[PDB]
Amino acid sequence: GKERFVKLLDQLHNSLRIDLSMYRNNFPASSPERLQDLKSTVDLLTSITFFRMKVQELQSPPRASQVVKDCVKACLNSTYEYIFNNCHELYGREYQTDPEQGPSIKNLDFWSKLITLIVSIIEEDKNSYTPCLNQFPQELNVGKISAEVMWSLFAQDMKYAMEEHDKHRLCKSADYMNLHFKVKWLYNEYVAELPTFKDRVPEYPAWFEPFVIQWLDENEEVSRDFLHGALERDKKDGFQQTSEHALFSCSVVDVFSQLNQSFEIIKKLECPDPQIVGHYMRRFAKTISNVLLQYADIVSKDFASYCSKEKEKVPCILMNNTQQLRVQLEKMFEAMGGKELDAEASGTLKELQVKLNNVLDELSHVFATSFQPHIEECVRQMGDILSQVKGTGNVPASACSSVAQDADNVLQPIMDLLDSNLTLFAKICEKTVLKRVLKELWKLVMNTMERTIVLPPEFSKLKDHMVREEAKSLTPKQCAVVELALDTIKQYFHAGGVGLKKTFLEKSPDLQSLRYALSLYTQATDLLIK
């Protein structure tokens, strides 16, 4: 009786389920009349379900929104199987231009085509079928289900496929790189904002992690080969400063223009896994180091070759270049996250900022020592003039030379250095660089003077062992001329305020070593009670 009726409904409910489990094939989006029949088919199913929820007062858990939902998922699983098995013909028929068959290990084309066909499905379920099945908007969004199912099926195939390529690597890294990019767009466009995924971090970046580390390895080798040819193009050019305001040559902007391009690649992927992005940054910090350290190692190898009077601007530029590495690195360090950057990556660059700074010191030391022969010749030449200083006002001569005049005559040999160069340096030197070069020339002058004009007394066998002889005192005038000459040298390094701060010159231990040396010869005018 009524048992013949319940079996009748089950068979009809079942028959409609079968029809909806292939809705895409049974109700093509091409036909508006057929999409209406789909709408009608879902209407008839809800009415049956609704009737059973009421009259069949027994519990009827088959809520209509879930039955349709599960029918849609079935069709999607079928759809994915169809496009997966006909990826080539479907793509070439529509998304074509000029001209095994599924997943290949020699090639990735199949996957870029599949992603295109997947989007076509999702877009179709969004534009065509979601407006059609508007019976339960709060619980049935075909387009959102399409994105979820199609991604999930695609994801588990892609996962396995990349595990296979990881153990083979028969394709260009550029191909794995472009695929990672196309997958990103797919995920962020259709999946990222879904409830199932709008929470935890995706897993797709891990599929490609080994392939970018390979691209980063290959990328570092391309950066080395670019560095070398970037300096030779600048060496043959003569290290011309790029502009009157730019104190560095063209090879510096070339190296950092590339290193940024390479970094930009890793950013277009918008890797959403912080553990993985930290891994990429860790590796690229190693590239930045080896590259920049190579830049620094190339100049040190050739820096002395440029230390001479002929080209004295060029050695100054190479120091400006080395300093420029220190600052544009910092600008790069910030681009990579600053303090947000991975610790190991941040430590690789700060440890590089140090080694780079130590190179600048070694370079300035080599540049100051490039003058040591000329300085020693200037200091023995001013020591001879000091020895010719003597009081002459004994007789009404009037033509006697004052202490002030004599100090100028003593400094004049070394003045050809200050005016001709220390006005050329500050003209073509980074502030930081100039400060380093002068601090080095300063040391060399105070050192040379402490060895030349002082003429420290020698050892000789006195009685039964070696004793140092008494110092030959300078005459009172000579004392006054030395001290004034020395104070003048200090002022010229101060250069009002352009050079070294008076606080450092006074505390300089090379000045204290010279002042103590003089004190042996300055007994005539030194005060007992200061």
Author numbering: 942 to 1040, 1050 to 1480
Relevant lines from the article:
Munc13–1 acts as a master regulator of neurotransmitter release, playing a crucial role in release itself and multiple functions in integrating the effects of diverse signals that alter release probability during presynaptic plasticity. Thus, neurotransmitter release is completely abrogated in the absence of Munc13s. This phenotype most likely arises because Munc13s play key roles in docking and priming that are associated at least in part to their activity in opening syntaxin-1 and thus stimulating SNARE complex formation through their MUN domain. However, the C1-C2B region and the C-terminal C2C domain are also critical for release, which may arise because these domains help bridge the vesicle and plasma membranes.
The structure of C1C2BMUN can be viewed as a highly elongated rod spanning ca. 195 Å and is formed mostly of α-helical bundles, with a total of 26 helices; the C1 and C2B domains pack at the N-terminal end of the rod. Much of the long rod is formed by the MUN domain, which is homologous to subunits of complexes that mediate tethering in diverse membrane compartments and was previously shown to be formed by four subdomains of about five helices each (named A-D and colored in blue, green, yellow and orange on Figure 1). Comparison of our C1C2BMUN structure with the crystal structure of the almost complete MUN domain (with the N-terminus at residue 933), which was described in Yang et al. (2015) and we re-refined, shows that the MUN domain is very similar in both structures, as expected because this structure was used in crystallographic phase determination by the molecular replacement method. Note in this context that the similarity in the structures of the two molecules from the asymmetric unit of the C1C2BMUN crystals and between these structures and that of the nearly complete MUN domain suggest that the overall architecture of C1C2BMUN has limited flexibility.
